[PDB]
Write a protein that binds this ligand. Structure first.
Ligand SMILES: [Zn+2]
Ligand SMILES: [Zn+2]
Length: 57
């Protein structure tokens, strides 16, 4: 855990401000910007964020 890490997927975000929107989409299994949906688990969300950077772009 850290000041730049999500409360659900335990992955990073482009900014500490978008990080608050990141967790609110992760709890529902969704990406905060490309709107893609998967399982609401860290294993599935990490697999998505490993290929997605629209999260703060
Ligand atoms: Zn997240
Ligand atoms: Zn995405």
């Amino acid at each position: 855990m850290g000041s730049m890490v999500c409360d659900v997927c335990h992955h990073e975000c482009e900014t500490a401000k978008e990080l608050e929107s990141h967790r609110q989409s992760c709890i529902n299994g969704q990406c905060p910007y490309c709107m893609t949906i998967t399982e609401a688990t860290e294993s599935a969300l990490q697999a998505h964020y490993s290929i997605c950077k629209l999260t703060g772009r």
